[PDB]
Amino acid sequence: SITTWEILAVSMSDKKGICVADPFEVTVMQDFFIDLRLPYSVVRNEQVEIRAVLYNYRQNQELKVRVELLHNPAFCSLATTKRRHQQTVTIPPKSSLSVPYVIVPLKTGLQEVEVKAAVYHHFISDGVRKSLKVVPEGIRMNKTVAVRTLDPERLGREGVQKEDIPPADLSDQVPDTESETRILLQGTPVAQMTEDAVDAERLKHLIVTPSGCGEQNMIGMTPTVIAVHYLDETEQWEKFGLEKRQGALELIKKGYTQQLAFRQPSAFVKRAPSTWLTAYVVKVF
Amino acid sequence: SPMYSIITPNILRLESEETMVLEAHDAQGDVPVTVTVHDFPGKKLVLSSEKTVLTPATNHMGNVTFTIPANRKGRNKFVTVQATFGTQVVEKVVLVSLQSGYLFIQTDKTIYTPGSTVLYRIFTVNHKLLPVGRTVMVNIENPEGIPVKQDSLSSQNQLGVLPLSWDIPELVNMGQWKIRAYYENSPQQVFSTEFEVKEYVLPSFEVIVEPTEKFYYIYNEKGLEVTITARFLYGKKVEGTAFVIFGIQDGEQRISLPESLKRIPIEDGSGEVVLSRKVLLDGVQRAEDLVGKSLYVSATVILHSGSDMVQAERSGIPIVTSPYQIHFTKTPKYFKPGMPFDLMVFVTNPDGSPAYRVPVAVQGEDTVQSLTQGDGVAKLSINTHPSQKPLSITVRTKKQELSEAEQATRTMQALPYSTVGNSNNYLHLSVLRTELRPGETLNVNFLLRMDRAHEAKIRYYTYLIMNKGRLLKAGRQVREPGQDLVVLPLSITTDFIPSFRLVAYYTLIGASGQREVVADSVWVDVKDSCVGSLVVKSGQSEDRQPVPGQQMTLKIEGDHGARVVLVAVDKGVFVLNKKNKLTQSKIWDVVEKADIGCTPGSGKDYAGVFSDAGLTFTSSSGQQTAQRAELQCPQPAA
Amino acid sequence: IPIVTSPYQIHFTKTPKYFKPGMPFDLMVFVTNPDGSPAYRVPVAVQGEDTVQSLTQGDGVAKLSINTHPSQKPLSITVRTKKQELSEAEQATRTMQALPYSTVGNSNNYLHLSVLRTELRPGETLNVNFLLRMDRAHEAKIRYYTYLIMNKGRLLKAGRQVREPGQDLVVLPLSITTDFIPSFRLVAYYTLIGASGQREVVADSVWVDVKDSCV
Amino acid sequence: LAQYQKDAPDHQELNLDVSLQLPSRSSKITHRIHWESASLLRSEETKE
Ligand SMILES: *[C@@H]1O[C@H](CO)[C@@H](O[C@@H]2O[C@H](CO)[C@@H](O[C@@H]3O[C@H](CO[C@@H]4O[C@H](CO[C@@H]5O[C@H](CO)[C@@H](O)[C@H](O)[C@@H]5O)[C@@H](O)[C@H](O)[C@@H]4O)[C@@H](O)[C@H](O)[C@@H]3O)[C@H](O)[C@H]2NC(C)=O)[C@H](O)[C@H]1NC(C)=O
Ligand SMILES: *[C@@H]1O[C@H](CO)[C@@H](O[C@@H]2O[C@H](CO)[C@@H](O[C@@H]3O[C@H](CO[C@@H]4O[C@H](CO)[C@@H](O)[C@H](O)[C@@H]4O)[C@@H](O)[C@H](O)[C@@H]3O)[C@H](O)[C@H]2NC(C)=O)[C@H](O)[C@H]1NC(C)=O
Ligand SMILES: *[C@H]1O[C@H](CO)[C@@H](O[C@@H]2O[C@H](CO)[C@@H](O[C@@H]3O[C@H](CO[C@@H]4O[C@H](CO)[C@@H](O)[C@H](O)[C@@H]4O)[C@@H](O)[C@H](O)[C@@H]3O)[C@H](O)[C@H]2NC(C)=O)[C@H](O)[C@H]1NC(C)=O
């Protein structure tokens, strides 16, 4: 390729990390050459014209050029197996010259066009052997096979929804062409439904410091315990104050310790054991 | 009164080493310190290790490097740091990020034809840009956002480089394709790079459209002058004819100007086209209205041989009343009452690129002036009064050759530093702002501000370094009684790149047996370049241009032990598409966006200075910072 | 071609021979090759402070700064080149002696002018720092500084720098033109009444080098 | 109210087990669309 390349470098060091180097350009040129320009794709049997530009970048030396289009059974031009289609044009110094070439693709597939040219007196030359895709006569399209909903729980009752899928008829598909079928599975999830909890922003009093006797200590520990349990399952500690939770855990643990000072061998230790109080202790604990 | 403080990054990260600065003020002898981290809420013990002792030989400063494992919605998750200094325990809750690192996708070409193969590499690195071995999930979506291929390779022992390839079928939709990759440990964070698919053919020459000015003055009689430069890929000049047109853009909508269509010849590989102001105004139906909109040029060169054809386009030409723009995005929004406030004026051209050599000043003080450096930042400094009233500053460009009407102005508002209990104790950090380069040394100035009644109590400053979202370094700056200004010889290495912050604070007892903390932060920009170095030049230290098929030596100057991946592409390809490439500048742009700091420096109070710099302060006395529970920085509220 | 034992030489010819007691003293290390031409990129430091460092610029001058005590005793400084690849034996050293600024009647009133020394270029602006040093008993008397500019042996300019009570550091936005070339000096002084109804004058001068190019 | 949050559903149950039997019938095909991933668009291509 007669052009300017751009080299990109990337270093990956475990000491200096990643680093993208500045692009380095390399110009590759020649005093004389051919720029055979072929279209991306050419329709079979269709006669088209291809350009062949011959560049001459000599200081002050117009070149007597002899350009020839090599024969190829895949194409139909003036050049045959026993006949050479060669012109003899002249190119001014520091300029270019286009050379027309009529051809007709005969067989599909990646074919090959080749042109060569040499100058008289000067011992220079350059041939170009590029390849162009030869596509038949057709047009892109994406016919929709089918679009149905898949839900065994709803459609088809039973529990194992089945679905018959007809193939693509494509009655108008150009012979000798490929075609792919794509299956797409997509989940259509529908969330929602969760009645909000307490604002909490205006609920900063449940953090009561447990104190008192046996039952008085529980009444003060009740709000704090259930408060943390509620804020944990609602993750509302952000709007309430994260650095406030630590002050709550201490009050809960403090209430637990104070309640141990009233654990009979089984309110006041001097008093007979209560059935309800003991049962409630289990609930909170 | 032994004061045990602790400082950690404002936002912690998973599978990465985050530093943690331990301390102990007015402490005697040694002190066993035990750092522990638990999940929130409850207790699961993500990390119990990492314990150290604060020795009086180190001014009682600790250093514990920890790492938070994985062991995996919409609501952020937090962790509870717990530092126990012997018996006294101090804990603080910090936000956690699911981002494990960055991913960079590189494709050989920018545009591909149906039938060819796409060669793409995935670079896997951490927050420190250092290579890492992880599991990566790579997908490829079509123009209509539909995945077609998905891989699951690992950069394990691959040196953070994942070479891949995919063949594009002949039967496929053309347009914009996308390659999306993400770490297996963070599905929410996805990186993507686009490559266009189109039936094309590499041209033989490029076309450049450069307007004389990188903008357009509404009151410019001459009009928008545009130059059409066309040259072959091999450098040689191009002879042909070009078709140039104009138009106005509005957000996403474009309005072509049929009466601006020109057909100028292209001699010597150059062309000249002009868009008269007459036609421009006639394009609409209030010149001051077009202000803000943009103009786009669309050229189309055709050789005199009619063999090849190229279409170029320049878009984004701003229509403004002023050749400049001023931004206070690099200037702290908080000043110290009665102390020199530094203004980092950021002058830039209408396009976005920094403006070099453009004098600026303040509303008053006609005498005060300052030119803009190569980075686009000017150095200004003003004296403030001991007033607790907000300071309003208006900076005005003073570039000659123009008029007071063509100048661009901008106004900001700085707020006084709220001191603890109105004790009027401040701390200012003035930095000699010049283009810092890895290897030089920086003179960090520490200016104290407090009555002599307690000035003898201050004997040291605690400074910390922020870099890429991690604590680079932290030390102490000695101070003797009677010194208001002390310099800190801070050597700049290759780590400070790109930008590094510097927070400094001191703590003492005064006023009325009340603990007080005063801090000040500053953000400095270092020259943006590769952490190391990588150069690629011609091996042949002589000769001219090669010939197709000829060999050539290719010298590569990089760091030792480093692996280098190469790729060569015909420039003709970039003529069709030059977007979505990979540049070192684009890398730093991403790293900077992932910064946890959201303020050029300073803050409303001591708890604000740390938070606005990406840090969290917590002491045994009670002085802590503002709770942060939001990933992204403050929503840019203009 | 010089035959010497150290590839470098140190000169304190660009460093003031007088320091302000208890104030940051600036050291302009002038490293040069054995021949005489300035040496580029050669780290230097002081006897102590192993951590302190500074590289040499293109002019052959390094930027050093040290903190002194309120002692009226002479300050001895030894600067040592710290260029790697060599040894402590191949390094060149030099020692100088700075004397404290004698204040009128021993009133201990000083004035320091610290300049951000970088290669000054006609068009830029210089931040002239004014650091005051005196008891608060008379600090409220100082309200302005009288600075003068020296250039090629003539007075280029002279003005006043305002100062409010309680300010130990004020900056002077001094714009550099094509006149300052090559080198320009800057003297600053203030006068007031104190101690015992006695007149006192305190001054401080500084010599800065501007880029050497055509006017 | 706290328990009401734990036993909360959010309306969902994407346990779909779709199978595909094309004439290529030489092996088998089975893709499962569970929650979390779910939306994940699984696709299959056949040149025939
Ligand atoms: C030491 O002595 C120096 C010489 O006297 C002083 O230098 C002058 O200082 C000023 C301020 O820095 C210089 O800068 C400016 O001058 C220009 C204008 O051009 C000038 O015209 C002046 C005025 O003549 C008349 O003024 C009256 C009153 O307004 C008008 O009615 C009349 O129409 C006309 O304007 C001259 O006096 C003048 O100097 C220039 O010829 C002005 O635009 C700026 O605002 C500013 O004044 C000025 O050029 C200096 N003079 C020179 C260089 O010749 C210096 O102030 C003083 N200080 C020291 C120590 O340097
Ligand atoms: C399945 O079949 C459909 C139908 O052929 C294919 O859709 C076509 O595909 C291409 C690529 O997605 C679409 O190109 C886009 O065109 C849009 C819109 O058209 C525009 O219309 C407005 C208003 O009239 C104007 O801007 C123009 O007239 C323009 O034509 C354009 O905005 C985009 O730039 C883009 O190129 C095309 O729209 C679309 N044709 C339709 C829907 O009729 C589809 O590709 C194919 N593939 C599959 C499997 O879906
Ligand atoms: C918080 O702690 C960290 C970690 O300790 C400190 O950061 C700096 O870490 C480097 C580690 O490379 C230390 O310097 C290194 O020294 C090693 C040689 O190993 C050590 O040698 C010394 C001297 O005998 C011993 O004390 C050690 O036990 C060990 O043998 C060398 O190979 C490296 O190249 C490097 O020079 C350095 O000690 C330390 N810097 C200091 C002192 O501040 C640092 O204390 C602090 N860091 C932060 C983030 O604030």
Coordinates of C-alpha atoms in Angstrom, one line a residue, chain B residues 105 107 138-149 166 175-181 190-197 580:
Chain B
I105 CA -10.9 -1.3 24.7
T107 CA -9.7 -1.7 18.1
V138 CA -17.1 -9.0 27.0
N139 CA -20.1 -8.5 24.8
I140 CA -20.7 -7.1 21.3
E141 CA -24.0 -5.3 20.5
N142 CA -25.3 -4.3 17.1
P143 CA -26.7 -0.8 16.1
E144 CA -30.0 -1.8 17.6
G145 CA -28.5 -2.7 20.9
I146 CA -28.6 -6.5 20.6
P147 CA -25.7 -8.6 21.9
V148 CA -24.5 -11.2 19.4
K149 CA -21.3 -12.5 21.0
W166 CA -14.5 -11.4 15.9
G175 CA -24.3 1.5 11.4
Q176 CA -22.7 2.0 14.8
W177 CA -21.5 -1.1 16.7
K178 CA -20.5 -1.3 20.3
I179 CA -18.2 -3.5 22.4
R180 CA -19.1 -3.6 26.1
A181 CA -16.8 -5.1 28.7
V190 CA -19.5 -1.1 32.1
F191 CA -17.0 0.2 29.6
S192 CA -17.7 0.6 25.9
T193 CA -16.1 1.4 22.6
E194 CA -17.8 1.9 19.3
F195 CA -16.7 0.9 15.8
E196 CA -18.7 1.7 12.6
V197 CA -19.6 -0.9 10.1
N580 CA -13.5 6.5 19.3

